[PDB]
Design a protein around this ligand. Structure first.
Ligand SMILES: CCCCCCCCCCCCCCCCCC(=O)OC[C@H](CO[C@@H]1O[C@H](CO[C@H]2O[C@H](CO)[C@H](O)[C@H](O)[C@H]2O)[C@H](O)[C@H](O)[C@H]1O)OC(=O)CCCCCCCCCCCCCCCCC
Ligand SMILES: CCCCCCCCCCCCCCCCCC(=O)OC[C@H](CO[C@@H]1O[C@H](CO[C@H]2O[C@H](CO)[C@H](O)[C@H](O)[C@H]2O)[C@H](O)[C@H](O)[C@H]1O)OC(=O)CCCCCCCCCCCCCCCCC
Ligand SMILES: CCCCCCCCCCCCCCCCCC(=O)OC[C@H](CO[C@@H]1O[C@H](CO)[C@H](O)[C@H](O)[C@H]1O)OC(=O)CCCCCCCCCCCCCCCCC
Ligand SMILES: CCCCCCCCCCCCCCCCCC(=O)OC[C@H](CO[C@@H]1O[C@H](CO)[C@H](O)[C@H](O)[C@H]1O)OC(=O)CCCCCCCCCCCCCCCCC
Ligand SMILES: CCCCCCCCCCCCCCCC(=O)OC[C@H](CO[C@@H]1O[C@H](CS(=O)(=O)O)[C@@H](O)[C@H](O)[C@H]1O)OC(=O)CCCCCCCCCCCCCCC
Lengths: 97, 176, 85, 185, 85, 49
């Protein structure tokens, strides 16, 4: 109901493994960001060709050793939010300390 | 062009808009903004099917029309309340436009969604600045309650003790 | 001949000019003007200073922080969540 | 009932402090300490230079400037960082830079006002044929002292452009009162 | 407010002369600015210089009626007297 | 005003000490709030000194 609700910011939208697997196999997920201390949560950034455009979804999984053989099998690039610029900023902070 | 009072147009009394007619200067501006907001919301909802344009359209236009009615005598408490209500509505429009965005303006790309500040937000911010720069003083007695730091050097022992007691201290020795 | 190279005198002239900028009647006038502005602002505010010096941490933020911290720390027990706090 | 000719204009309490006795009102920087007209006044009648500091900052504070609000709570932090959080040396060099910039912008505004006088003469010729080609020096000083609203400026320019009448001026704009929105500002 | 009108007139004459080009002699009290050949805009520039020198606000209504150096000094001296209040 | 601005500027800390005579003529009945001590206390309270 995108024509009925008011717009309220952009919150994540908790999915499930099955939902994410469906939209990964159908080629709607562009990038995944594994997060959680236990690394069991995923930020899924969808592509513009998906039915809904770019949406940053949030998925929680069981530990299934078949995620890679679906994501990189179809199209999905895994990534982490800590780039070399963030690492160098951390090194600068350690130097200041 | 014929609002507020009379009008002469380059013959006699040329500076007639600046005469005090009894109303707020921004009365016809907020009434015109209410009219164009209601019309644009109804037209957008008819053209697209989204219901946020009509709900955030006529719903804010009615409040702006009531504020413009209350600003027709801007020398009273209804005038002050009307200019405050109109500023609140226009500030809410600006806030929604630059923070959340418009649902019917949702697009596929995240960079294309981009809440931004379009003509409606610009007009509401211009109305806000018009209220601030013409007249908003009035109902200045409504503020946060005075602190015990206000009444530390106050010459009124009764007022200092009233603020003392209201702010929870109460039994602290005054020694004044 | 020319000993002026490697200009330690020119890099110390910046500090000399910095020292000479102050201790003048212009800087005394600026300080007195700043005292006037501080006096005006201190008479204007008189409530926000008490809010920020007395109220804002001790009676607004710190009780919220310790209650949220205690409820985040202690187990989901009636004694630890209600009666002991 | 007891209608005294003129319709009673209610005199509300002031919301802004009156401008200082050393002010110029023309976007030019004021003097450093002494407003330079005291030398053209007698001694012991220049007592109202400190009697402006008193009742501009101690004894005649408008109560609209003592209002406690969320915006004033936030703004106290900016003022505290300016006064007790930033060194007076850096405040002094920034004060000198702002003084020089304000002198430059005053020279720019003065040149703009003189050009507006020339435009005043041009619009007063196109609208009265060729007879009236002067310009209002009182309106020139009014533009320089920022006493005119943009609506007053537009109405006067239009008035010149289609009937002439240089010495028929718009009303002086009232000072803008301090805006108040309950507990917000 | 007991303004020294002689001092005010002397400084007014000095400002008028300084802007235009004449000496302090040619700027006489009874002399009209028109005699000195200051144009309309030049008279306005002279009023601006007087405002800048005396650090006061010139009485706008009545600036169209500043004809003599004596009138300029009298309006200025009245404004110096009215500034302190 | 000179004393208040010297205090708020900090210069009163490093200024030369001075003596000032105050005259309030004897017309108050008994000791019903002396205006000299009232004025000096207001000076010190305004300056927080
Ligand atoms: C100095 C700065 C001064 C202000 C300059 C801007 C004033 C332009 C008028 C406002 C406008 O352009 O705004 C146009 C209005 C907008 O109406 C409002 O529209 C809003 C959404 O607009 C957004 O969507 C619109 C298209 O749907 C436009 O893109 C607009 O720029 C953008 O902000 C609300 O959600 C509601 O639908 C409705 O209240 O439409 C209309 O056609 C109104 C005209 C109908 C005739 C009466
Ligand atoms: C001979 C010496 C050599 C150097 C001297 C001159 C060269 C360079 C001068 C400074 C750099 C450029 C300044 C231009 C704009 C001013 C910056 C500013 O924002 O404006 C500063 C204002 C102006 O000062 C105060 O300003 C007050 C408020 O007025 C103005 O205050 C603001 C001005 O920003 C607003 O614009 C506001 O609208 C307007 O009213 C008063 O009116 C007075 O003017 C005065 O008390 O201060 C404040 O509030 C903020 C206080 C802290 C800000 C510090 C900014 C810069 C510090 C440089 C330190 C480096 C040290 C090395 C020396 C070399 C310098 C680069
Ligand atoms: C979009 C529609 C715009 C409608 C608003 C202006 C049209 C009529 C209102 C009017 O007469 O203004 C009258 C109001 C002034 O209003 C008067 O102001 C006085 C000033 O102290 C007093 O407060 C009086 O109480 C108040 O009535 O002027 C304006 O706000 C607009 C005048 C022109 C400014 C921009 C040009 C707009 C051109 C479009 C139409 C002409
Ligand atoms: C379409 C509907 C409207 C959409 C937006 C259009 C903007 C409307 C604002 C203009 C109204 C002007 C007006 O009321 O004139 C009428 C005003 C009324 O005039 C003044 O009124 C005062 C109140 O009584 C006093 O009487 C003054 O003496 C008198 O001069 O005249 C002026 O021009 C004074 C200055 C106007 C204030 C600022 C204009 C606001 C717009 C610019 C801000 C930009 C900020 C962007 C962010
Ligand atoms: C959208 C939110 C907009 C908030 C309100 C904007 C205009 C209100 C106003 O009068 O500004 C007055 C403020 C000071 O607040 C004033 O500050 C005063 C103390 S002082 O001037 O800093 O010394 C204080 O007494 C007074 O209550 C407080 O309003 O002056 C400014 O410098 C405005 C800068 C920010 C705009």
């Amino acid at each position: 109901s995108v024509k009925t609700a008011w717009r309220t910011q952009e919150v994540l939208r908790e999915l499930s493994y099955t939902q994410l697997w469906a939209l990964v196999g159908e080629g709607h997920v562009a990038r995944v960001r594994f997060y959680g201390p236990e690394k069991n949560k995923v930020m899924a950034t969808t592509r513009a060709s998906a039915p809904g455009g770019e949406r940053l979804c949030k998925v929680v999984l069981p530990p299934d050793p078949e995620l890679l053989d679906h994501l990189v099998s179809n199209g999905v690039v895994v990534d982490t939010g800590v780039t070399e610029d963030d690492r160098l900023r951390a090194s600068l902070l350690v130097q200041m300390l | 062009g014929g609002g507020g009072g009379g009008g002469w147009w380059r013959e006699d009394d040329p500076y007639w808009p600046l005469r005090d007619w009894g109303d707020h200067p921004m009365r016809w501006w907020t009434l015109a903004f209410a009219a164009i907001m209601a019309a644009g919301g109804l037209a957008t909802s008819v053209a697209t099917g989204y219901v946020e344009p009509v709900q955030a359209g006529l719903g804010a236009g009615s409040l702006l029309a009531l504020a413009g009615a209350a600003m027709s005598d801007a020398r009273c408490v209804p005038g002050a309340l009307g200019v405050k209500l109109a500023w609140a509505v226009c500030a809410l429009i600006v806030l929604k436009e630059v923070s959340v965005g418009w649902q019917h303006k949702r697009k596929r790309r995240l960079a294309a969604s981009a809440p931004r500040l379009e003509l409606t937000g610009l007009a509401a911010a211009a109305l806000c600045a018009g209220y601030m720069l013409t007249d908003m003083s009035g109902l200045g007695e409504v503020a946060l309650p005075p602190n015990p730091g206000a009444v530390f050097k106050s010459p009124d022992v009764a007022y200092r003790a009233s603020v003392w007691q209201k702010w929870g201290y109460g039994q602290v020795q005054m020694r004044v | 001949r020319a000993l002026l190279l490697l200009p330690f005198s020119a890099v110390g002239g910046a500090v000399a000019a910095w020292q000479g900028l102050f201790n003048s009647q212009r800087y005394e006038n600026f300080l007195m003007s700043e005292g006037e502005r501080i006096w005006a602002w201190r008479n204007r505010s008189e409530n926000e200073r008490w809010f920020w010096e007395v109220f804002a941490w001790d009676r607004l933020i710190f009780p919220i922080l310790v209650i949220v911290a205690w409820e985040y720390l202690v187990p989901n027990h009636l004694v630890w969540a209600v009666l002991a706090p | 009932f007891i209608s005294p000719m003129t319709p009673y204009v209610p005199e509300e309490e002031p919301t802004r402090t009156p401008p200082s006795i050393k002010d110029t009102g023309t976007l030019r920087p004021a003097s450093e300490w002494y407003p330079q007209w005291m030398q053209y006044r007698r001694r012991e009648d220049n007592y109202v230079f400190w009697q402006d500091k008193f009742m501009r900052c101690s004894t005649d504070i408008p109560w609209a400037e003592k209002r406690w609000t969320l915006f004033s709570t936030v703004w106290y932090l900016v003022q505290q960082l300016r006064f007790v959080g930033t060194p007076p040396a850096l405040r002094y060099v920034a004060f000198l830079g702002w003084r020089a910039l304000m002198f430059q912008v005053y020279a720019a505004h003065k040149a703009l006002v003189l050009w507006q006088c020339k435009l005043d003469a041009g619009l007063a010729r196109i609208g009265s044929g060729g007879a009236t080609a002067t310009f209002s020096k009182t309106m020139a000083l009014r533009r320089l002292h920022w006493r005119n609203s943009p609506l007053a400026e537009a109405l006067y320019a239009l008035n010149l452009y289609k009937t002439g009448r240089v010495h028929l001026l718009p009303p002086v704009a009232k000072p803008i009162p301090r805006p108040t929105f309950f507990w917000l500002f | 407010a007991a303004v020294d009108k002689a001092k005010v007139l002397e400084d007014v004459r000095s400002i008028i002369s300084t802007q235009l080009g004449t000496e302090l002699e040619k700027v006489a009290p009874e002399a009209k600015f028109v005699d000195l050949g200051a144009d309309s805009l030049d008279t306005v520039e002279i009023m601006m210089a007087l405002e800048e020198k005396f650090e006061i606000a010139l009485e706008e209504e009545g600036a169209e009626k500043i004809a003599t150096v004596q009138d300029a000094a009298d309006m200025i001296a009245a404004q110096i007297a009215a500034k302190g209040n | 005003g000179s004393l208040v601005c010297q205090i708020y500027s900090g210069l009163f800390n490093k200024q030369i000490s001075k003596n000032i005579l105050l005259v309030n003529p004897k017309t108050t009945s008994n000791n019903l709030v002396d205006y000299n001590v009232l004025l000096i206390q207001a000076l010190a309270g305004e300056t927080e000194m």
